[PDB]
Design a protein around this ligand. Structure first.
Ligand SMILES: CC(=O)N1CCC(Nc2cccc3cnc(Nc4cnn(C)c4)nc23)CC1
Ligand SMILES: NC(=O)Nc1ccccc1
Length: 282
């Protein structure tokens, strides 16, 4: 049931790409009559030993995640031997939250944004409970299941923390837009559940700006600003932060600023954030 035959997976279109991977819309069509269910299918864009090790890790992480707020693992398709060729996941036609916010902004009030915030927070609370660091939390990596339901996706950079260590150090620079990284990530490539909280603060910013490009983190940096990464680290060290989005509830902007505490140990846990978002929502 969790094993998909390659010859039954019919290619339809590209859904997205990044971090050496593509996600394709396929039909799983064993009848070959175009009546089969649609699935989102991730594969490496091209072969590579390091990317393959990372891909098998991603499959093993997502397979073991069971949450209303995490994109659903369906199964795998196999290449030669035990080599995973494709990761088969549920298809969410509404696509990424970034796109959904830009298109439907006139329809989505503060209450709805707080509902999405609460759901992402509950997803991240669960990830933390599994000792999983996402490392790439952003509105582009959150999917819309329905009007009132979002799910976290994109576990391509996710890592499991050992039982005796609450952070990990990456050797090579990140390739994600720099405006979502915590200062300790920008400076020393240190990632933790607390660096995911920093990124969640930027996701709250994205939600309450409806991902408007004109007040994007990039746009704000270029107005607020030496290599860009060093300049951003300097601004953050000075205590400069993204401004309150237009018409943003003061309490929501206060929560963003707590997520952006300079020291990771001073940032609120997702467990602490959850009730505060739920309180604002109702
Ligand atoms: C922004 C970007 O390039 N991304 C890569 C592709 C990713 N898409 C999905 C990954 C995993 C499971 C998915 C299930 N459904 C969908 N649906 C969908 C519809 N339109 N789009 C763009 C995505 N995407 C998934 C979103 C982020
Ligand atoms: N977290 C936060 O406020 N980041 C930031 C600051 C200035 C420009 C772009 C991003």
């Amino acid at each position: 049931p969790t094993i998909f035959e390659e010859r039954h997976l019919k290619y339809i279109s590209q859904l997205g790409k990044g971090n050496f991977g593509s996600v394709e819309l396929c039909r799983y069509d064993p009848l070959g009559d175009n009546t089969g269910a649609l699935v989102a299918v991730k594969q490496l864009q091209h072969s590579g030993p390091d990317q393959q090790r990372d891909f098998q890790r991603e499959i093993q992480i997502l397979k073991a995640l069971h949450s209303d707020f995490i994109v659903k693992y369906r199964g795998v398709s196999y290449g030669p031997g035990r080599q995973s060729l494709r990761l088969v996941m549920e298809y969410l036609p509404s696509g990424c939250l970034r796109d959904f916010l830009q298109r439907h902004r006139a329809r989505l009030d503060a209450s709805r944004l707080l509902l999405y915030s609460s759901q992402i927070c509950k997803g991240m609370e669960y990830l933390g409970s599994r000792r999983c660091v996402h490392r790439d939390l952003a509105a582009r990596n959150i999917l819309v299941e329905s009007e009132a339901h979002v799910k976290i996706a994109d576990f391509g950079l996710a890592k499991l923390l050992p039982l005796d260590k609450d952070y990990y150090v990456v050797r090579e620079p990140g390739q994600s837009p720099i405006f979502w990284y915590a200062p300790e990530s920008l400076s020393d490539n240190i990632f933790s559940r607390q660096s995911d909280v920093w990124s969640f603060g930027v996701v709250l910013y994205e939600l309450f700006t409806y991902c408007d490009k004109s007040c994007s983190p990039s746009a704000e940096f270029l107005r607020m600003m030496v290599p860009a990464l060093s300049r951003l680290l300097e601004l953050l060290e000075e205590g400069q932060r993204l401004p309150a989005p237009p018409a943003c509830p003061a309490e929501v902007h206060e929560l963003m600023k707590l997520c952006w505490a300079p020291s990771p140990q001073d940032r609120p846990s997702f467990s602490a954030l959850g009730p505060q978002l739920d309180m604002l929502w109702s």
